[PDB]
Write a protein that binds this ligand. Structure first.
Ligand SMILES: O=c1ccn([C@@H]2O[C@H](COP(=O)(O)OP(=O)(O)OP(=O)(O)O)[C@@H](O)[C@H]2O)c(=O)[nH]1
Ligand SMILES: [Mg+2]
Ligand SMILES: [Mg+2]
Ligand SMILES: [Zn+2]
Lengths: 79, 50, 1350, 49, 277
DNA sequence: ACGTATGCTATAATGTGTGCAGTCTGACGCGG
DNA sequence: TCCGCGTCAGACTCGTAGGATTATAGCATACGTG
């Protein structure tokens, strides 16, 4: 997680799409103030986003479902 | 730039920047001196009849 | 702000007026005391806007209360100073003026369009001669120049009916009258008649320019400027210095030259002055305009104050010092610092020392941020002061943000990607950066006073990018070669060698230990040496069939040192690897083994631990540099004293007059050369095994523990080559001319050089260090050249869906296999099903990666030749597939889609050359028994009874029991074979023998020698001796030859006893061997000869260490595709050879193919010898002549996979000579890019037609729609392009101007009216956008679906 | 370079001919240059400055 | 042939009349009465005289070609106002014009920063006085030494020497070798970097918080006076235009807003901390 | 009134020239 | 169209150092704004 990012690349595949998924999640915790899934243990967003991907909690499909699940709650509610 | 066998006694073979201004810049030899016209000249012990 | 494309078109006088916000009509910059703009001047605020943010000049309207208010008095708007660099101006030119970029920038452009030369146009401009615009009376036709005499003749005689004028006015009217529609059709008609090469070229280029000009919407009148734009004043500044001085750009000065002369012309047109004066004024005006656009071009550049030339407009867009290279692709960057680096031997791989006061300033906005969070700072200027006072609790906050934050460390120069690596900063008190020893290799960073730039990744993406891609742990192997660049060096290797290496008995021999821990116990207890043979019990962990590790415990007889090293060794490798004495070469395999087996993590750890123990134990050894360590052999004074008398013997023979000066010069070099190797080997023979004095019972022989040897043997520093100078003999030095001194240096560095021995050492020293400075630029310029062409290549598709590739064989050159097939065909997707010898069962699939483990089964089955899916065989339009490239050698598995290869490839090729800056081949000895197998050989038996070879490229194979090539040699021309073709030889037998310092000319027939065209004085010379009178004849070449015997070819003609010619067996060729220049001949006219006798001996002086200095140019020329001055002839199409007609020896060839009825003729020189001898079954592209192969000749005939195989072999040959390791796929990248454009041959559905040369990807996309719709196919023929040209070919003009020739690129792109839609990296890095590759590949393609969705 | 006269030869201006073309040049302390040079056809030429 | 604009014009003047004493009078007498052809000739003829006068007036401001053009304009004004009836020659009268027109045109197009004649005229006498002094003092004269010989002001001499200070181009090599110019050093005055930009943004956002933390009528009256929230920076007396309409109550409420705000800066950690600034 | 600008003077005088000249490999573009 | 000669295009990457010019008459009414 701090030294290694190979365990994180194992899960997704593309070194490039890993940085994009990890960044988007890092930004949700940085701005939205979302909760970390893994014990943060005094690490910055960078590392935590990798840990969730490394262990297998964060994914392209996972984050897209979760997004519109909060946004569809708003749809039904407004009108 | 290359060291020329004339340098012997006149100019130092090992005194020059190692930069692009390498072979152009050169220090004068220890006992080297200027010729009355302009060239360089070096001291030499004359040998008379051996 | 967010766009799609950038367009370039010609600036119409009407268009220039759109940008201009006023007309500068005065040169007045500012008032002298009141530092303010002048009335309609060059800094006018009424034209270019206000000075400060929202302030008029006189001061009537202030700040945003008067948002967009225009003042009455001064007439100045109240907007931001923003507009002072945005708002432009113009000048109404009294008389029209010509653009230098559409006149001088060749092609003429203005002259190319008019079908008019340069001289003609210029003499019109400078008012030397008039030019006809249109003659009503057909007496005078258009574009006919009339001298000042000839204008007057037509005036009174004809007049009026003819309209002709002078100056830039005339040529504009000529451009304004010419019809692009009609003169396009006229040229097309003349093309149908009788077309040649030059005629059709000229016509087609004009045709396309004419059509391009109409479709670009440009009008040829805009080539002449009626309106001249003015640059915004802020972009040509008049700003004051701190010292009360001012400073102005040279543009302002050049502008004042234009406006003054233009206003003086307005004044003279008011006075109706005589034309003679008006002429000067118009010439001047043009001089000023041309000097403003591009100063140094038409004539002398207008020099200014400090006798230097004024910097013009074009100059700020031109080359290195232009905006592109200097202020756009290269940038000074914030959150950046540099400092002296020093060692960090305590750090782990993923760590680096960062000074506190450095990181303090670097992370300034991150302190202010974390401060407001804790509530210590309420505002930022409060946080600013908290940092300034350097109070204690601010250090702890700085320390907080930096944790889990990577920093980029760069070293100059940035050769390859590894020139930057990311680490986790460790704050250290001190002004020095501390760098990790193992990655020192990648940077080439020596702690001798190196500095490394620091950079802070700001964005979270940059923190992830730095940790993911640019982290030191994620970057192990080189991208160039699949090899670990983080290999321990110097002390590390020496320390391990010391440990593993063993010695006789010593303390505690043959003891018995529980584990490798008891070995550390006893050594550090002082009851065992690291060099004690011991039977220890170690438990090794071997991998099984699955992922599970099997444990095995056994007694290994190894040393105390070897046992201790096992502690560092991860569990998964066998113990047999550390059971040997470890060296640099052995250690490099340990890490590679560790990598291919366990993975990444285990290696990083292993690599570090190897380094740490290496340094530690190297220091424990006590390894020093005493002067008794530099042992001179026993008998040096015995070798030299009698090797001197050897040379003194020949010296007395020369003055007698037998051995010539040249023969003595070569003969004395051979004596010294033997003595030098004699001293070298006696030295190491006394130094390597100096330890012959041991114990136990009486004696034993052992490796020497001489400090210097251990330091060389281990592979830590220096080598056998360096020790030679230290203890042995310095060797023979080289003159600055290139000739080698007859007398070398006898002494060494221990003994001391005399005064001259040092003077001699200088010559070699200064020239070696001169090529370190000067020759580095050619190699660094190559890196630049390679990159530009390979910018666009990125992995796009996953699978190109192609079943093509190129076959690969094992590099077995010079007996010992140079490069095995396993390594060559490693990490490359195959294109064909490759099984074992017995064709009855498949072993490896088609579309599969070759892992080192799959390549191990290639060894069991002994693969012959393999079709690997290559880069050039890719069908992916705009990029390549991951299958075609294969593994990313840097990573260690299949390449990611989106990774930008082209740049990785270019770097890999240029990196070694840039950092990288005994020919007694008498006889081949075969080593294993075999049957002799020659190929491409045509020999003839001689008088002696020996198979003499009369063919240039003869190869010699060594066939084993089952029938496969083991060893391979190059047998040269006129070589004497021991045994002919098919005969058995034993091991250690001289199969071939020849003279190296000579190239003989050997006959094929017997009889007498005739002299033809060998006149004394014209073609040859003559020199005789004494008593008898033996004369030698020396053939003069065009250099030493007079104009009399230039077309005379000198040759030694063969004749019989009668005097007639002797036919060469089975050919109608009378025997005639043409002697080249400087050919020494011993036999004079009228001498009997047998077949196989040497007629003449051509000298082969070749004693210059090629190194990299004289080997990089050859690489460049290959890439740049520059045809040699003696290319070899090849057959075009297959069929029947039929020799035809001749012209004073100049041979033709009337080839009549079997299917092809129409003959084909091509001409051949006389002196050049062929390989085929007529009437033969030739195929497409057979070797007819010998010499260098032209790259264009290869692809033209033998297709893509032939030219790719050539460049790859040819390039690698030069790098293999140096021990530079590059995968062929990296060269294949550049090759692919060199095959970008292709000439079209055949009319298609699109308006392609003939003579057009379009990109290969675009024309193939048209063929996609054609095979679906039918219509007419567009047949083609791929062309090869040099690097410099392949870069300027890409549709992107931005990428082309950013490279070079920037003055031309822009003008051609302006006239074409081309719009660049951006694909390359250079293109998006300029505009400062997301790179359409790597991290940004996922983003750019998400914008491409915005375009696709409607 | 010391003023006076100096004899040189481009060991192959045109490696086409490969002819060693010999040339002379008078170098003054102040003044115009005076060069003499041969050509592929060994015709003596003078090029002031 | 000839492709230098210099030699071409210099050729065309070389094939133009060279007039006699009585010829000049014949043409000039018709030139005043407007013969058209006559004015062209006298001019064409004496272009040769303009070039000889421009051979001494070079290396001062413009080029030789620039001096001839403006020297020709002097010959033209000399032809526009010559007196043929006078027995004196033309070459004499025309020289006074050609020397004048050149000097004047150099005085304008020589300096980038347009220096009018008045400040320049005087500067010359100060410089030409420096000659006299320099030769007899053998020491380059000071601002005082020039002032003591003319008996004129000290600041005048000094300020006139300040305008003689010439320019260095921002595109001038530093060290006589491709390295860096003055533009790669000289900074931008107008825009100060983010740190100075964010100073004011953060300082002025902190004030927006401090005003909403004051009284409703205290932050109304205090803000609209200084022009912080309002549109125009009013005075104690001018706050009465809005709703205040008071002179005493406005001054007590302005200062009441500032006193409560001074305690807000003492507690947040500025006051004397931000006093140095 | 103060600052800038335009103007005239009259021996005769009538065609300029200046300034670095071991760079070099490679590549076209007009004539011949 | 092919071969000689002219002009014109490049020249590995980052750090540091320091300085200076000549001269344009002389005086009297004409042109622009508080
Ligand atoms: O002009 C130069 C000279 C040298 N260098 C660079 O500086 C370094 C000087 O040479 P090093 O001291 O680094 O040499 P090395 O490690 O390759 O070999 P040894 O001394 O161990 O024999 C090398 O890495 C070289 O690339 C330049 O970049 N430019
Ligand atoms: Mg170093
Ligand atoms: Mg080193
Ligand atoms: Zn105003």
């Amino acid at each position: 997680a701090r030294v290694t990012v190979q365990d994180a690349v194992e899960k997704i595949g593309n070194r490039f799409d890993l940085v994009l998924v990890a960044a988007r999640r890092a930004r949700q915790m940085q701005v939205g103030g979302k909760d970390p899934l893994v014990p943060e243990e005094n690490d910055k967003t960078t590392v935590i986003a990798l840990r969730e991907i490394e262990e297998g909690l964060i994914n392209n499909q996972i984050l897209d479902v979760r997004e519109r699940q909060e946004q569809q709650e708003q749809e039904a509610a407004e009108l | 730039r290359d060291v020329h066998p004339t340098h012997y006694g006149r100019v130092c073979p090992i005194e020059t920047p190692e930069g692009p201004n390498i072979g152009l810049i050169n220090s004068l030899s220890v006992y080297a001196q200027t010729n009355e016209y302009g060239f360089l000249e070096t001291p030499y012990r004359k040998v008379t009849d051996g | 702000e967010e766009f799609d494309a950038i367009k370039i078109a010609l600036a119409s006088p009407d268009m220039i007026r759109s940008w201009s916000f006023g007309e500068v009509k005065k040169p007045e910059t500012i008032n002298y005391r009141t530092f303010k703009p002048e009335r309609d001047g060059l800094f006018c605020a009424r034209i270019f806007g206000p000075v400060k943010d929202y302030e008029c000049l006189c001061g009537k309207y202030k700040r945003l209360k008067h948002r967009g208010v225009i003042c009455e008095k001064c007439g100045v708007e109240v907007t931001q100073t923003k507009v002072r660099r945005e708002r432009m101006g113009h000048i109404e030119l009294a008389s029209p003026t010509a653009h230098i970029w559409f006149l001088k920038s060749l092609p003429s452009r203005i002259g190319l369009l008019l079908d008019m030369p340069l001289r003609d146009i210029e003499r019109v401009l400078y008012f030397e001669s008039y030019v006809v615009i249109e003659g009503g009376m057909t007496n005078l036709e258009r574009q006919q120049i009339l001298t000042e005499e000839q204008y007057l003749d037509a005036l009174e005689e004809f007049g009026d009916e003819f309209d002709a004028k002078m100056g830039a006015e005339a040529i504009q009217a000529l451009l304004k009258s010419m019809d692009l529609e009609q003169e396009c059709e006229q040229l097309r008609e003349e093309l149908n008649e009788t077309n040649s090469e030059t005629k059709r070229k000229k016509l087609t280029k004009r045709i396309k320019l004419l059509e391009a000009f109409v479709q670009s919407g440009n009008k040829p009148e805009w080539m002449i400027l009626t309106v001249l734009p003015v640059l915004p004043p802020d972009l040509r500044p008049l700003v004051p210095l701190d010292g009360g001085r001012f400073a102005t750009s040279d543009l302002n000065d050049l502008y004042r030259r234009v406006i003054n002369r233009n206003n003086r012309l307005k004044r003279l047109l008011d006075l109706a002055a005589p034309d003679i004066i008006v002429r000067n004024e118009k010439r001047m005006l043009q001089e000023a305009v041309d000097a403003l656009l591009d100063n140094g071009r038409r004539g002398r550049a207008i020099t200014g104050s400090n006798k230097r030339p004024l910097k013009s407009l074009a100059d700020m867009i031109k080359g290195k010092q232009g905006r592109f290279r200097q202020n756009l692709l290269g940038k000074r960057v914030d959150y950046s610092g540099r400092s002296v680096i020093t060692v960090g031997p305590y750090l782990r791989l993923h760590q680096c020392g960062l000074p506190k006061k450095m990181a303090l300033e670097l992370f300034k906005p991150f302190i202010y941020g974390k401060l407001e969070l804790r509530g210590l700072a309420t505002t930022i200027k409060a946080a600013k002061k908290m940092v300034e006072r350097e109070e204690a609790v601010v250090w702890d906050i700085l320390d907080e943000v930096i944790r889990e934050h990577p920093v980029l460390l760069n070293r100059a120069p940035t050769l390859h990607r590894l020139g930057i690596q990311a680490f986790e900063p460790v704050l250290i008190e001190g002004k020095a950066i501390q760098l990790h020893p193992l990655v020192c290799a990648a940077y080439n960073a020596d702690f001798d006073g190196d500095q490394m730039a620091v950079h802070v990744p700001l964005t979270l993406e940059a923190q992830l990018e730095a940790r993911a891609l640019m982290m030191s742990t994620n970057n192990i192997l080189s991208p160039a070669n699949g090899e670990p660049i983080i290999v321990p060096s110097q002390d590390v290797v020496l320390g391990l060698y010391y440990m593993t290496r063993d010695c006789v008995n010593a303390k505690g021999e043959g003891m018995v230990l529980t584990g490798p821990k008891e070995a550390e116990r006893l050594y550090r207890s002082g009851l065992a040496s690291l060099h004690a043979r011991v039977k220890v019990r170690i438990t090794e962990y071997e991998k099984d069939a699955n992922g599970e590790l099997v444990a095995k415990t056994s007694l290994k007889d190894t040393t105390v040192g070897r046992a201790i090293l096992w502690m560092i060794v991860p569990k998964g490798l066998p113990y047999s690897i550390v059971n040997q004495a470890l060296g640099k070469k052995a250690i490099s395999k340990m890490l590679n083994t560790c990598y291919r087996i366990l993975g990444l993590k285990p290696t990083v750890i292993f690599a570090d631990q190897i380094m740490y123990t290496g340094f530690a134990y190297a220091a424990r050894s006590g390894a020093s540099v005493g002067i008794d360590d530099m042992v001179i052999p026993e008998k040096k004074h015995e070798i030299i004293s009698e090797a001197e008398a050897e040379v003194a013997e020949i010296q007395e023979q020369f003055q007698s007059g037998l051995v010539t000066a040249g023969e003595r010069y070569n003969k004395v070099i051979d004596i010294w050369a033997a003595a030098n190797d004699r001293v070298s080997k006696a030295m190491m023979d006394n130094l390597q095994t100096e330890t012959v004095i041991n114990r136990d019972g009486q004696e034993e022989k052992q490796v020497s523990f001489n400090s210097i040897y251990m330091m060389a043997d281990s592979g830590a520093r220096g080598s056998a080559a360096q020790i030679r100078q230290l203890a042995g003999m310095r060797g023979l030095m080289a003159k600055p001319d290139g000739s080698i001194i007859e007398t070398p240096i006898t002494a060494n560095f221990r003994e001391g050089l005399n005064v001259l021995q040092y003077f001699i050492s200088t010559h070699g020293a200064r020239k070696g260090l001169a090529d370190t400075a000067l020759k580095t630029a050619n190699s660094g310029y190559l890196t630049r050249r390679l990159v530009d062409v390979a910018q666009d290549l990125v992995v796009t598709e996953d699978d190109c869906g192609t079943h093509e590739g190129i076959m690969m064989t094992p590099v077995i050159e010079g007996g010992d296999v140079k490069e095995p097939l396993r390594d060559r065909v490693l990490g490359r997707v195959t294109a064909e099903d490759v099984l074992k010898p017995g064709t009855a069962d498949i072993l490896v699939p088609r579309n599969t990666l070759l892992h080192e483990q799959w390549c191990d089964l290639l060894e069991e089955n002994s693969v012959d030749a393999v079709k690997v899916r290559s880069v050039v065989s890719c069908d992916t339009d705009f990029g390549v597939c991951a299958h075609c490239y294969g593994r990313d050698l840097a990573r260690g598995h299949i390449i990611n889609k989106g990774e930008a290869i082209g740049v990785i490839a270019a770097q890999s090729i240029g990196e070694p050359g840039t950092q990288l800056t005994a020919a007694a081949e008498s006889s081949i000895q075969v080593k294993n028994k075999g049957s002799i197998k020659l190929s491409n050989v045509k020999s003839v038996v001689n008088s002696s009874g020996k198979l003499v070879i009369t063919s240039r490229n003869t190869e010699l194979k060594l066939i084993d029991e089952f029938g496969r090539t083991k060893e391979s040699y190059k047998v040269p021309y006129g070589a004497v074979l021991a045994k002919g073709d098919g005969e058995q030889v034993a091991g250690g037998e001289t199969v071939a023998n020849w003279d190296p310092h000579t190239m003989p000319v050997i006959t094929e027939v017997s009889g007498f020698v005739r002299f033809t065209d060998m006149i004394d004085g014209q073609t040859i010379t003559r020199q005789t001796d004494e008593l008898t009178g033996l004369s030698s004849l020396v053939v003069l070449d065009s250099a030493e030859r007079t104009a009399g015997g230039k077309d005379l070819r000198p040759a030694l003609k063969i004749v019989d006893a009668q005097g007639n010619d002797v036919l060469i067996p089975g050919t109608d060729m009378p025997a005639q061997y043409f002697l080249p220049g400087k050919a020494i001949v011993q036999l004079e006219d009228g001498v009997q000869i047998s077949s196989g006798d040497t007629l003449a001996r051509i000298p082969q002086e070749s004693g210059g260490t090629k190194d990299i200095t004289g080997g990089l140019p050859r690489v460049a020329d290959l890439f740049e595709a520059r045809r040699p001055k003696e290319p070899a002839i090849l057959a075009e199409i297959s069929g029947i050879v039929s020799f035809g007609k001749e012209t004073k020896g100049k041979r033709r060839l009337v080839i009549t193919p079997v299917d092809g009825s129409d003959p084909y003729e091509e001409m051949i020189p006389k002196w050049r010898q062929l390989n085929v001898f007529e009437g033969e079954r030739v195929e497409r592209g057979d070797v007819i002549s010998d010499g260098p192969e032209a790259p264009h000749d290869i692809l033209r005939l033998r297709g893509v996979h032939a030219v790719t195989r050539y460049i790859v072999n040819e390039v690698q040959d030069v790098y293999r000579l140096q021990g530079v390791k590059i995968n062929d796929k990296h060269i294949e990248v550049i090759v692919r890019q060199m095959l970008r454009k292709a000439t079209i041959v055949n009319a298609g559905s699109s308006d392609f037609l003939e003579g057009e040369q379009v990109e290969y990807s675009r024309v193939k996309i048209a063929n996609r729609e054609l095979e679906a719709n039918g219509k007419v196919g567009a047949t083609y023929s791929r062309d090869l392009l040099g690097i410099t040209k392949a870069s300027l070919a890409t549709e992107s003009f931005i990428s082309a101007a950013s490279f070079q020739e920037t003055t031309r690129v822009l003008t051609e792109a302006a006239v074409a009216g081309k719009r660049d839609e951006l694909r390359g990296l250079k293109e998006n890095v300029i505009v400062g956008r997301l790179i359409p590759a790597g991290t940004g590949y996922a983003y750019h393609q998400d914008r491409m679906r915005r375009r696709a969705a409607g | 370079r010391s003023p006076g006269v100096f004899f040189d030869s481009d060991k192959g201006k045109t490696h086409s001919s490969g002819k060693v073309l010999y040339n002379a040049r008078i170098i003054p302390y102040r003044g115009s240059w005076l060069d003499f040079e041969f050509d592929p056809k060994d015709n003596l030429f003078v090029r002031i400055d | 042939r000839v492709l230098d604009a210099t030699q071409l014009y210099l050729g065309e003047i070389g094939y133009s009349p060279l007039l006699t004493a009585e010829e000049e009078v014949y043409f000039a007498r018709r030139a005043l009465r407007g013969d058209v052809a006559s004015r062209r000739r006298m001019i064409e003829s004496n272009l040769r005289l303009v070039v000889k006068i421009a051979r001494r007036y070079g290396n001062r401001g413009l080029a030789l070609l620039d001096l001839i053009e403006e020297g020709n304009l002097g010959l033209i004004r000399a032809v526009e106002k010559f007196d043929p009836e006078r027995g004196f020659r033309f070459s004499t009268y025309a020289t006074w014009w050609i020397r004048q027109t050149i000097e004047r045109a150099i005085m304008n197009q020589t300096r980038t920063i347009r220096l009018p004649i008045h400040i320049v005229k005087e500067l010359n006498v100060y410089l030409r006085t420096a000659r006299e002094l320099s030769h007899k003092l053998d020491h380059e004269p000071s601002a005082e030494e020039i002032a003591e010989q003319l008996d004129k002001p000290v600041d005048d001499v000094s300020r006139m020497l300040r305008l003689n200070e010439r320019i260095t181009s921002v595109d001038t090599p530093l060290g006589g070798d491709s390295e860096k110019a003055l533009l790669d050093i000289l900074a931008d005055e107008k825009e100060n970097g983010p740190e100075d930009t964010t100073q004011d943004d953060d300082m002025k956002q902190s004030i927006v918080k401090w005003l909403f933390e004051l009284n409703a009528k205290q932050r109304e009256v205090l803000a609209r006076r200084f022009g912080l929230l309002g549109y125009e920076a009013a005075t104690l007396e001018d706050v009465g235009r809005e709703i205040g309409l008071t002179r005493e109550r406005v001054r007590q409420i302005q200062v009441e807003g500032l006193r409560r705000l001074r305690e807000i800066l003492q507690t947040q950690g500025l006051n004397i901390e931000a006093l140095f600034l």
